[PDB]
Amino acid sequence: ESHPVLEKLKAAHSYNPKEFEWNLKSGRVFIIKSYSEDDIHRSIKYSIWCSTEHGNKRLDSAFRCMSSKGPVYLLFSVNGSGHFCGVAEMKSPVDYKGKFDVQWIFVKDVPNNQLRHIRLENNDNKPVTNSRDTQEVPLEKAKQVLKIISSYKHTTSIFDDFAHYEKRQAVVEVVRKERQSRNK
Numbered sequence: 001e002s003h004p005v006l007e008k009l010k011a012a013h014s015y016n017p018k019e020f021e022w023n024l025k026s027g028r029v030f031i032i033k034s035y036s037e038d039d040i041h042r043s044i045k046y047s048i049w050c051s052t053e054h055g056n057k058r059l060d061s062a063f064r065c066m067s068s069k070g071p072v073y074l075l076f077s078v079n080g081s082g083h084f085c086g087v088a089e090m091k092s093p094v095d096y097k098g099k100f101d102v103q104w105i106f107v108k109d110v111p112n113n114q115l116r117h118i119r120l121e122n123n124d125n126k127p128v129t130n131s132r133d134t135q136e137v138p139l140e141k142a143k144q145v146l147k148i149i150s151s152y153k154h155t156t157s158i159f160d161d162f163a164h165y166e167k168r169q170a171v172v173e174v175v176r177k178e179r180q181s182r183n184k
């Protein structure tokens with residue numbers, strides 16, 4: 001019993017491509033910390049992201065500075081989750097409440113213990129699994145992370161709970177409309 005939104009997305013995009021070039025000639029790579037699974041679900045279905053106001057300025061500057069020299073990749077993790085949940089490529093500058101276009105590439109859970117040994121010299125040598133939102137990963141360590149994420153034989157992903165997130169979204173909209181209506 002697959003959800004029609006997810007079947008449409010899977011037919012229109014090649015998630016988790018078996019051929020992905022982790023050994024980047026160029027590009028910049030940033031950590032994205034999401035506040036919830038629900039935000040990841042929206043990002044995948046609508047191909048957009050919003051960071052904080054400071055986070056949006058950092059990402060906007062990197063995208064415009066990259067000027068299509070190469071990609072800007074985003075490594076997603078929800079706060080407190082203990083795994084990374086995928087990778088998207090940033091696909092537009094920030095549009096202003098800033099949003100920007102993203103293209104999701106990997107959708108798969110990679111547990112933190114697979115990436116913990118990789119430390120970020122530009123962030124007091126802490127593990128990449130201990131980053132804040134829009135932490136930049138140096139190029140050579142980004143290749144190592146992308147190599148691990150790309151080849152990891154995942155057992156699950158947010159797609160396994162897709163219908164649950166769809167139902168939560170639809171219920172929340174109705175709850176809000178009714179509340180707004182009682183406020184009249």
Ligand SMILES: CCN(CC)CCNC(=O)c1ccccc1S
Nearest residue numbers: 038039040042043048049050099
């Ligand atoms: C309450 C947190 N959250 C629930 C879905 C709403 C705020 N989050 C967004 O509105 C958003 C989510 C994904 C991609 C872009 C945006 S702008």
